Amino acid sequence: GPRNLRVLLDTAIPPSFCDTVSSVLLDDFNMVSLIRTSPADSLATIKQDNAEIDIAITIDEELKISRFNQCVLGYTKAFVVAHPQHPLCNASLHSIASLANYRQISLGSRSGQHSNLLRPVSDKVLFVENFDDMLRLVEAGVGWGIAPHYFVEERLRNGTLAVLSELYEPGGIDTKVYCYYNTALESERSFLRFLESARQRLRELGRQRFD
Amino acid sequence: RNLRVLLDTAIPPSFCDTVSSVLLDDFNMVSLIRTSPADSLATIKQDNAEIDIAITIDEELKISRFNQCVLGYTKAFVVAHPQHPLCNASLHSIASLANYRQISLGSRSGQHSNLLRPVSDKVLFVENFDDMLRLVEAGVGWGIAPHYFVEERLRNGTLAVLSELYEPGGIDTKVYCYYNTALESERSFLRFLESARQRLRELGRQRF
Ligand SMILES: O=C1C=Cc2cc(S(=O)(=O)O)cc(S(=O)(=O)O)c2C1NNc1ccc(S(=O)(=O)O)c2ccccc12
Ligand SMILES: O=C1C=Cc2cc(S(=O)(=O)O)cc(S(=O)(=O)O)c2C1NNc1ccc(S(=O)(=O)O)c2ccccc12
Ligand SMILES: FC(F)(F)c1cc(NCc2cn(-c3ccc(Oc4ccccc4)cc3)nn2)ccn1
Ligand SMILES: FC(F)(F)c1cc(NCc2cn(-c3ccc(Oc4ccccc4)cc3)nn2)ccn1
Ligand SMILES: [Mg+2]
């Protein structure tokens, strides 16, 4: 419970999003400790009763977890990228099958079983533990991948990466960011104050890109 | 020649009209077909439906002859009669919901996408939103309804929301556009997308 709030935030949440969630927690709760995992292992980690994790902020959806409630905290944007001379830039156009005929570089779990959300499309798949690794193989020409905006922002501008999804969803694949909280927190007014403020600031931050 | 566009009933009317007004700028014959969201993807997959475009909230990755693209967004609410048990507590999990009866859209077949598949094993199927809400008023169950379908009755007080702590403003729902691959070349289509998208975006931000 609040004694030591332990919060897990996956690596697809962007720094701005994280640092915002941090402010509000430290403002409403009074011991806070943070854990980071790739989206692969968010839900796995919180399910081990071992990990005593009170709140978890992740893009991965599991409709109902044992001890945990689900709400939607905000949104974030992810891009299909490849190397500029990759063949899927050759093609002007893409469907989700033009892709599955090529090597996808995909996040993997320590388990090896995958959410519907993080399920690879292709069967030409190759698997990596984190996004830096993923981007290293994409950058070298090995396949395509699905990464957060903030991880490919710089390299897209620089031309060292290309984007295949702008026809699919101009601006980015909008990905909900779920907040899974413990039952203990249901009752807590502080957690409800935290939802209010975080939502409101994440909203401000997110709408603020259109200035 | 005849552009057969399909539009499920979760697409708000302003959304449909925006699509009509934009197709008319680049097409001279255009058929508009409505279907429940539970039957859209089935309808296009039938081979002799000659459906060129389908606008719908239901999702699949790969469909036979069909590209996919995200056209916009829309908002949907878990609703319930106000004196329903659920209203009185606060709802933090979908497990409090699966314990009551759900008034869901039933399928022409019986198979349902992940999105439109009911939650409870306590389910009551219907064929349109009109019906789903007659029941939910009468007190029979809770259900998920397009935002426009419940706007006025949430003001009446006829009807209550259970989603507002889940996702305030409403459960954000993507509206996909599945388009025959004959359309990927044609300038007409791509300017439809560009203008439909621009207009739908102006339309959604206008709520503030
Ligand atoms: O989080 C949101 C919470 C509420 C919200 C409400 C509306 S509301 O106007 O309809 O009430 C709209 C939006 S919106 O910005 O997504 O439309 C939101 C939110 N979206 N926030 C963000 C979008 C994209 C990015 S990104 O850089 O990582 O791609 C963000 C990065 C850091 C922090 C927030 C981001
Ligand atoms: O369609 C959208 C297309 C682009 C878009 C871009 C941003 S962008 O700022 O990130 O670039 C934001 C948004 S947004 O408003 O959803 O954030 C959108 C869109 N959303 N449109 C709508 C939302 C909710 C409702 S409804 O509740 O009455 O059904 C709508 C009803 C009719 C027509 C459009 C609706
Ligand atoms: F990076 C990240 F945040 F961790 C992240 C976010 C995720 N979001 C979930 C999701 C992924 N897709 C999607 C997949 C492929 C695609 O390809 C095309 C299809 C049709 C036309 C053109 C291209 C377009 C969309 N949509 N939603 C998933 C994984 N990883
Ligand atoms: F109306 C409509 F557009 F046709 C439509 C849209 C759909 N969208 C898909 C979807 C539905 N849910 C969702 C389901 C229940 C829910 O209940 C709670 C859970 C936890 C806390 C509180 C309440 C919250 C969210 N999330 N995504 C699906 C079907 N039908
Ligand atoms: Mg949005």
Residue numbers in the entry:
A (entry chain A): 91 to 301
B (entry chain B): 93 to 300
Quote from the publication.
The eponymous PQS (Pseudomonas quinolone signal, 2‐heptyl‐3‐hydroxy‐4(1H)‐quinolone) and its biosynthetic precursor HHQ (2‐heptyl‐4‐quinolone) are both QS auto‐inducers acting as agonists on the transcriptional regulator PqsR (also referred to as MvfR). Among the various possible drug targets, PqsR is particularly attractive, as it is the essential transcriptional regulator of the PQS QS system serving major functions in PA virulence. Blocking this receptor results in affecting a number of down‐stream regulated processes such as virulence‐factor production, e.g., pyocyanin, biofilm formation or eDNA secretion. Due to its central role in virulence regulation, PqsR has been investigated in various studies as a promising new target for treating PA infections. It has been shown that small molecular agents, which act as inverse agonists on PqsR and thus inhibit QS, are able to reduce the production of the important virulence factor pyocyanin and the auto‐inducing alkylquinolones.
It became evident that the para‐substitution motif was suitable for growing. This was surprising, as this direction seemed to be occluded by residues Ile186 and Leu189 in the X‐ray structure and modeled binding mode. Nevertheless, we installed a number of substituents having various chemical properties in this 4‐position (shown in derivatives 9–15). Indeed, this attempt proved successful, as we discovered phenoxy‐modified compound 4, which showed a highly improved potency at IC50 of 11 × 10−9 m. The exploited growth vector was further endorsed by a co‐crystal structure of 4 in complex with the ligand binding domain of the transcriptional regulator PqsR91‐319. Herein, we observed the opening of an additional pocket upon binding. The para‐installed phenoxy moiety causes a 4 Å movement of Ile186 as measured by α‐carbon distance. Such observations of receptor flexibility and induced fit reshaping of the ligand‐binding site are fascinating and likely the reason for the observed non‐additive SAR. Optimized lead QSI 4 demonstrated high potency, suitable PK for pulmonary applications, a favorable safety pharmacology profile and was well tolerated in mice. In a murine lung‐infection model with a mucoid PA isolate, we successfully demonstrated the target engagement of the QSI 4 by recording a significant reduction of the proximal biomarkers HHQ, PQS, and HQNO.
